[PDB]
Amino acid sequence: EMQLTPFLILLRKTLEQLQEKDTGNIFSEPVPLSEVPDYLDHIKKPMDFFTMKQNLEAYRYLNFDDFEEDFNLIVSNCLKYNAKDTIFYRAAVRLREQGGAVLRQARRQAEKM
Numbered sequence: 001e002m003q004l005t006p007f008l009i010l011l012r013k014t015l016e017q018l019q020e021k022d023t024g025n026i027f028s029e030p031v032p033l034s035e036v037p038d039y040l041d042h043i044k045k046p047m048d049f050f051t052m053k054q055n056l057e058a059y060r061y062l063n064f065d066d067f068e069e070d071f072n073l074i075v076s077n078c079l080k081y082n083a084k085d086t087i088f089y090r091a092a093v094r095l096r097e098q099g100g101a102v103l104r105q106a107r108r109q110a111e112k113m
């Protein structure tokens with residue numbers, strides 16, 4: 001029951017804060033199938049922050065949960081594909097932790113609207 005423009009402004013800010021936690025920029029673009037050619041064998045919906053930005057501006061995120069679901073996909077795809085003893089897996093754990101705090105505060109702001 002809120003206005004669209006401030007909500008999208010909030011999602012844009014939140015997406016930027018989430019990208020800021022991905023200091024290695026390993027989640028900024030789709031996992032490159034050129035370097036990971038079997039990635040799609042068990043990853044049924046790849047996700048990344050560039051795709052999320054495209055989805056945002058295409059008005060595909062009209063509630064907080066749909067935005068957060070695609071963030072969670074970035075994390076879960078990485079935990080699924082990569083072995084636990086890899087930098088990639090640990091980076092997804094850290095993103096889940098740091099991004100979770102970003103999302104909780106952003107959702108508080110959206111609920112104020």
Ligand SMILES: O=C1CNc2ccc(C(F)(F)F)cc2N1
Binds near residue numbers: 026035078081082
């Ligand atoms: O799960 C992931 C997360 N992103 C990523 C970037 C680059 C590469 C690679 F280019 F292959 F080094 C692999 C991955 N795998």
